[PDB]
Amino acid sequence: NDTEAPQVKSGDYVVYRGESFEYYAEITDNSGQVNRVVIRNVEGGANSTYLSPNWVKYSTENLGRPGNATVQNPLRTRIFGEVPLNEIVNEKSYYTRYIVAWDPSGNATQMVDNANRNGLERFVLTVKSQNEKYDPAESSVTYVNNLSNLSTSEREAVAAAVRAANPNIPPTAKITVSQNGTVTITYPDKSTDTIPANRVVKDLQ
Ligand SMILES: [Ca+2]
Ligand code: NA
């Protein structure tokens, strides 16, 4: 007499080359119980569990127990992995995937191929370049002798000030500064952010 499938809440799952990610989806059922969770590509029919890319992993604690999937304490599925440096992106790449859960009566969440289900049982995994994860602080001011001709010492000073203001940028990202004070941050995936000189340097001319 339970003919209602488990309901899923996911999110906007943005991930970044060279970075780990972790998201948690939430699942409830009217019976209070969920016995199985699969995350999958749309194709392949009812028995398919195929999911790509292969670096997308998931796990669900406490399956198959009474009351493991209620509104007050939803079942949670960890969706996680490590994005390779060699993923192809433009600004981004999209992968649309589905979370299917089963209750004890065998009712399974239905896959509906429509963007108006995104954030429920359907989610978009958006892969972005590494630069997009970081918003470099354009706080810091380095006084130089002449804004049109920074010395090596002045360029190193600017780079050190940018690093000190940005502890969360990847340690192995490379901060370089040109002879006019323009800052380039080159991330491990070789994408870049740039900071115009007038946000980091001044002179007294
Ligand atoms: Ca149900
Ligand atoms: Na950025």
User: The CATH number of the domain where 167 resides is what?
Assistant: 3.10.20.890
> Which DSSP helix (H) or strand (E) runs through 152?
helix 152-164
Say yes or no: 127 and 140 in one domain.
no
Q: Which of 84, 101, 135 is the last residue of a domain?
A: 135
Say yes or no: 124 and 201 in one domain.
no
- Distance from Cα 93 to the centre of ligand 2, integer Å: 17
Which residues, 6+ apart, have CB-to-CB distance to 118 below 8 Å?
Answer: 10, 12, 96, 124
Q: Which of 135, 156, 178 is the last residue of a domain?
A: 135
Structural domain containing residue 188: 136-205
Closest ligand to residue 70's CA: 1
Question: E strands within the chain?
Answer: 7-9, 13-16, 20-28, 36-40, 57-60, 75-82, 92-102, 122-128, 142-144, 174-177, 183-186, 192-195, 201-203
- Distance from Cα 178 to the centre of ligand 1, integer Å: 62
For residue 72, give both structure tokens. Answer: 């007050």
Q: Is 106 helix (H, G, I), strand (E, B) or coil?
A: coil
Strands 201-203 and 122-128 come out as unpaired
Beta bridge partners of 20: 82
| Number of other residues whose CB lies within 10 A of the CB of residue 83 | 22
Say yes or no: 153 and 128 in one domain.
no
Number of domains in the chain: 2
Give ion ligand 2 contacts, CB < 5 A: 131, 134, 193
- Distance from Cα 91 to the centre of ligand 2, integer Å: 12
Say yes or no: 45 and 86 in one domain.
yes
Q: Side chain identity at 174, as an amino acid letter?
A: K
Experimental method: X-ray
Say yes or no: 33 and 79 in one domain.
yes
Model resolution, angstroms: 1.4
- Distance from Cα 51 to the centre of ligand 1, integer Å: 25
